[PDB]
Design a protein around this nucleic acid. Structure first.
Ligand SMILES: [Zn+2]
Ligand SMILES: [Zn+2]
Length: 1107
DNA sequence: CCTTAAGAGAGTCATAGTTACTCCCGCCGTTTACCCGCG
DNA sequence: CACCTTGC
RNA sequence: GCAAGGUG
DNA sequence: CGCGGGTAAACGGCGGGAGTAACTATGACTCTCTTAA
């Protein structure tokens, strides 16, 4: 139980031990340190409100106004939680927000108007049968003699006056009539097969290649390829496959180096388990810690089930090889034709090198066991690479030897018992890295060649998920505002990349537009595709892939998108989607996942028939469970959700979303009621912080893991979800408290130290409330200036600009600085324009679009830190210094204890009577030891005597280090040279190292950077008091030249430039100069820590050991 | 061997904006179904 | 240069 | 493992 | 049948308006002061 601590409780007896520790803060200290784990909550006796945060209860203590628990009355208690309310206002508003499902139910119920007493109650007892018979007879009795006869009586219980009344209802002098209509759905995209011959000229690329090779041979161009293979191919050879495979084998053997052999370099006590855990974690931190970060944050490991290889085999054998007869795509047509000129260009080793650069070097090598690193080692020039690549390309016969690839099962689930199934293993297929690179090259060529529909936002340059999500949210809000019904249908097909039959993609490509050369090339690429299933100590014998694009091959994305395009096309051909403005946007698309946006339930039905047809042609399998959907319907005031019937996707009730229900989409939690469900950020954040806290991750390591791995995870959702500043502030507060506890910093520490970057001296901790707004604004602008004019139009009419302005302000950007969202952005190329034209487009880099930023915040915290009187004294020295801050990131050798107190000293908040005095006025501050008014930290430095000997020993120790280095640099030692100046008094300088005839007078000193002129005053004193001298040393050392410079140092470790001038006068190379400055600074800081330690001993440990 | 000084953030409640509608809503105008004598 | 997302 | 995007 | 004028009652169309639970965001204050492998 959370032990009830009904504050005020002065010094209570800690119930976990019943020990009177002290003030409630002292009780905290107790429970936190020794008696943790046990539950405890401070109670606010008056209101009895309880909080695990003492501070908060103290905040009550004045604030709290008694027993504030009484609940206001009323006469509308909202059914579910019976929250009494003043009026219906409060009631159905509680429905609206707190209890919105029943609210939708009420909305719909009242929605059914069924009002109609517009008739005015004039209605009477007429019968429709009598009305129809009267109408027919009057048609028969049109003003023709003996007109009533039947009318008067055959309508029993009526009068001619009543007949006149009814005629006055319909026809006045006569009867009347009515009419009706009916709509229909749309289908039949399953016709008109188009393939007749080669889409592009059979030799269109072949003829170009022949011409280019002729030009090269005549002019000896730089295009690389084996001569004989191309000679035979031009010669119309029959066994070209044989020869091309032979050359392949030879060149690959060149790349199949002898890859370097692995060069990677009672009795029952639980201590072994803890030591192994600590060892594992420390090693992973030393080694790759991405694995460590996953293990910690996810709380997981690596899994390898032992499911009978026989089974696993049967499954995948029957899956990959299993085929389905592709009938065709009927009328399904995609975007448009594809240009072939993009391929006319021949391969350039420059381009291949380029592509190589854009590779995951850290990738497991294929069966060849050859890596991109290995590959480059073989040919860092891509000369032979272009050679054999062109060999194949021009020939068109990819070697079958390289085809063999390795397959991997990914333990999708976490629970072992779930893992037992085969459904928790996404199969990864990895082939020859050479094959991978060639594939990506051709893939880039194709992607340029074949244009996809804009609506597919997957696997392209545009920023995908953000665009889709923002568009969806907008659309929803826009619709609700516009008071117009709308239907939403999520779709998801299984085995997106796996069920695909090679034959159908063959077909698809046939009509797109492509030279038969590349056609056959791709076929061969996907022809004779064997692989083995790597598992533990066994890889299954070969399996011939006949269905499913090779999982891992760079092509698979492009090919899949290509096969899917026809669907998107046909859907737009329906042009029955939501008529946003002019555009009738039908559906969005990302990779495989897609939606459907019609305007009427029946329009959506039409869409579904189209989809069903598509599956029929493709033989694809969609399911209601695999899919979700929901409908919107406007009211007089608000919108109703799902008011209509659930659909019948694949003849199955599409699972509908109801208010409050959320279904994941691109990692989000789309809720029709509120668009995106508010993400559970605090919960995941706290969980992660707990996991980190409770591990062998010595504090510095905790901070490193945090800043470098944890934050991005939360960044993604926080930014992608419109998040308000207050919640971010709360999260930042949580993080600050947690880290401060981690490193046992004093509570009141200034934030600026925490937030400022390590390079600037700070802890480099993110400030979500300051960072997320900038990311959000960047996304906003990025989407605004998109290529899809539709997306633009949408955002524009959705007046995103106001949000952009507001964010830019919120992130801290100035109103004037607000860029005009319409204007273009900076388009860099990482290449001098000259070099840019020098090369070809295929070798051109990717022009990433630089975007504005509202402001820099790290600098903001830095500035505020500077402004601080106490915690911010002398720090400005450390701004934009790449030397002093270094140890923060590479505090090697420092003891964790030393390092932590080093943080404190750097912050000037170390325990000292002044520090204990700081803030709290009424106290004593006199330096215990000497007399200093404030028992400050600087008086220690020099003023405070007791040290004396230690100060001297440290000083001459540093002098000794520099001396030791001196002889190493052939600087003749003439240090500690007792002198006798004009006063014949000992002015022994630190160092007078002589060389040739130059004698280098030096003055080693280390001063705390209290003021700004510290070191320049030092130097002025150096020269000033030294001055004269000259002659005496001139003859003593027999030197013809004498220096007088100094060597001041920052006590904290600040490295002035004067010592640097000494270094350059010494002749040290620049790189060694930086190395020396860094190391020397760390030594300075360490010996300062020693000074501290000593003093702290002096009096404290003196009393402890000697009472 | 060197320096003058000495809150800073944690935290709660108060109050104003503002969302999101929703509620609604009352008042005047329209529509309905008859209601009545005549060529 | 390290991380993160999604989606296979 | 692959394709993109983002972040310091 | 034709053939006019009356009917007066929902509702809906429209001006507006009026309110509001519950977030979101500043403002104004007060309390806080010791544990490294
Ligand atoms: Zn209270
Ligand atoms: Zn002193």
């Amino acid at each position: 139980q959370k032990t009830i601590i009904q504050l005020p409780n002065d010094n209570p007896a800690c119930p976990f031990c019943g020990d009177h520790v002290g003030k409630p803060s002292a009780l905290n200290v107790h429970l936190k340190r020794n008696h943790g784990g046990r539950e405890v909550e401070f109670q606010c006796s008056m209101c009895n409100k309880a909080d695990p945060k003492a501070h908060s209860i103290l905040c009550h203590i004045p604030k709290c106004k008694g027993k504030v628990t009484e609940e206001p009355t009323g006469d509308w208690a909202c059914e579910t939680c019976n929250k009494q309310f003043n009026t219906k206002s409060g009631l159905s508003q509680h429905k609206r927000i707190a209890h919105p499902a029943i609210r939708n139910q009420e909305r719909i119920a009242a929605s059914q108007p069924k009002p109609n007493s517009q008739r005015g109650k004039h209605n009477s007892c007429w019968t429709v049968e009598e009305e129809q018979l009267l109408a027919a007879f009057n048609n028969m009795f049109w003003g023709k003699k003996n007109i009533n006869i039947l009318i008067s009586d055959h309508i029993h219980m009526k009068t001619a006056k009543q007949i006149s009344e009814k005629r006055r209802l319909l026809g006045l002098n006569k009867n009347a009539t009515v009419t009706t209509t009916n709509p229909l759905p749309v289908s039949s995209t399953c016709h008109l097969k188009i393939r007749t011959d080669s889409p592009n000229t059979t030799t269109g690329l072949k003829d170009t290649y022949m011409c280019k090779i002729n030009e090269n041979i005549v002019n000896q161009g730089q295009i690389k390829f084996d001569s004989e293979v191309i000679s035979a191919w031009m010669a119309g050879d029959s066994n070209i496959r044989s020869l091309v495979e032979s050359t392949s084998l030879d060149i690959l053997s060149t790349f199949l180096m002898e890859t370097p052999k692995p060069r990677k370099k009672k009795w029952m006590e639980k201590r072994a388990v803890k030591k192994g855990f600590y060892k594992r974690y420390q090693h992973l931190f030393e080694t790759d810690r991405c694995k460590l970060a996953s293990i910690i944050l996810d709380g997981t490991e690596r899994l390898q089930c032992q499911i009978p290889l026989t089974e696993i085999l049967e499954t995948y054998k029957s899956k990959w090889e299993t085929l389905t007869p592709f009938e065709g795509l009927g009328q399904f047509k995609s975007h448009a034709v594809a240009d072939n000129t993009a391929f006319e260009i021949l391969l350039s080793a420059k381009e291949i090198m380029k592509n190589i650069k854009e590779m995951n070097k850290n990738s497991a090598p294929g069966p060849d066991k050859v890596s991109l690193r290995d590959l480059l080692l073989a040919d860092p020039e891509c000369n032979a690479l272009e050679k054999l690549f062109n060999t194949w390309l021009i020939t068109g016969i990819i070697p079958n030897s390289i085809k063999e690839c390795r397959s991997l099962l990914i333990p999708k689930t976490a629970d072992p018992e779930a893992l037992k199934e085969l459904g928790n293993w996404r199969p990864l297929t990895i082939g020859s890295i050479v094959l991978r690179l060639f594939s990506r090259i051709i893939t880039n060529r194709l992607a340029k060649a074949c244009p996809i529909n804009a609506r597919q936002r997957g696997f392209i340059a545009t920023p995908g998920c953000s665009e889709n999500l923002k568009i969806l949210h907008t659309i929803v809000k826009q619709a609700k505002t516009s008071k117009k019904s709308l239907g939403v249908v999520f779709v998801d097909i299984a085995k997106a990349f796996d069920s695909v039959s090679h034959d159908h993609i063959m077909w698809v490509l046939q009509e797109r537009g492509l030279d038969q050369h590349i056609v056959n090339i791709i076929e061969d690429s996907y022809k004779k595709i064997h692989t083995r299933m790597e598992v533990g100590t066994e890889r299954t014998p070969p399996i011939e892939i006949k269905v499913g694009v090779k999982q891992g091959d760079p092509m698979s994305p492009l090919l899949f998108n290509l096969a899917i395009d026809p669907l998107i096309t046909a859907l737009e051909k329906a042009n029955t989607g939501f008529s946003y403005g002019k555009n009738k946007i039908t559906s969005l698309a990302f990779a495989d996942d897609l939606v459907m946006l019609s305007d009427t339930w029946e329009g959506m039905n039409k869409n579904i028939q189209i989809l069903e047809t598509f599956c029929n042609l493709s033989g694809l399998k969609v399911q209601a469970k695999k899919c979700y959907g929901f409908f919107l319907s406007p009211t007089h005031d608000s919108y109703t959700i799902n008011k209509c019937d659930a659909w019948k996707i694949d003849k199955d009730s599409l699972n509908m979303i109801q208010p409050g229900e959320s279904e994941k989409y691109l990692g989000l939690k789309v809720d029709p009621w509120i668009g995106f469900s508010k993400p559970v950020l605090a919960e995941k954040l706290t969980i992660w912080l707990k996991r980190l806290t409770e591990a062998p991750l010595k504090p510095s390591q905790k901070l490193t893991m945090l800043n470098i791995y944890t934050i991005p995870r939360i960044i993604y959702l926080a930014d992608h979800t419109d998040t308000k500043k207050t919640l971010l502030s709360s999260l930042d507060d949580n993080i600050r408290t947690v880290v401060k506890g981690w490193l046992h910093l004093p509570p009141d520490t200034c934030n600026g130290f925490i937030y400022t970057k390590t390079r600037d001296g700070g802890l480099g901790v993110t400030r979500l409330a300051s960072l997320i707004p900038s990311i959000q604004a960047r996304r906003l602008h990025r989407i605004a200036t998109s290529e899809d004019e539709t997306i633009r139009n949408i955002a524009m009419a959705n007046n995103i600009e106001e949000e952009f302005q507001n964010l830019w302000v919120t992130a801290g950007g100035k109103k004037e600085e607000i860029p005009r969202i319409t204007d273009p952005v900076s388009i860099d190329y990482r290449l001098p324009r000259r070099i840019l034209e020098l090369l070809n487009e295929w070798e051109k880099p990717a022009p990433k679009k630089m975007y504005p930023i509202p402001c820099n915040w790290r600098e903001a915290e830095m500035a505020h830190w500077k402004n601080l009187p106490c915690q911010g004294s002398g720090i400005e020295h450390f701004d934009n210094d790449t030397i002093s801050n270094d140890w923060l990131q590479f505090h090697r050798g420092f003891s964790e204890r030393q390092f932590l107190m080093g943080l404190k000293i750097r912050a000037n908040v170390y325990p000292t009577r002044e520090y204990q005095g700081r803030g709290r006025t009424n106290k004593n501050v006199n330096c215990r030891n000497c007399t200093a008014s404030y028992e400050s930290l600087s008086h220690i430095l020099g003023q405070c005597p007791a040290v004396q000997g230690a100060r001297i020993r440290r000083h001459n120790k540093l002098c000794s280090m520099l001396k030791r280095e001196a002889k190493e640099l052939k600087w003749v030692v003439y240090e500690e040279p007792h002198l006798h100046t004009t006063e014949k008094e000992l002015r022994k300088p630190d160092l007078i190292f002589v060389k040739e005839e130059m004698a280098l007078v030096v003055d080693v000193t280390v001063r705390f950077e209290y003021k700004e002129k510290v070191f320049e005053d030092a130097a002025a004193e150096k020269v000033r008091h030294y001055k004269d001298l000259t002659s005496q040393i001139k003859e003593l050392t027999g030197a013809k030249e004498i220096e007088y410079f100094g060597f001041p140092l920052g006590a904290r470790g600040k490295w002035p430039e004067i010592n640097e001038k000494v270094l350059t006068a010494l002749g040290m190379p620049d790189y060694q100069q930086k190395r020396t400055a860094k190391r020397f600074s760390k030594r300075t800081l360490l010996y300062s820590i020693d000074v501290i330690n000593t003093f702290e001993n002096i009096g404290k440990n003196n009393k402890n050991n000697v009472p």
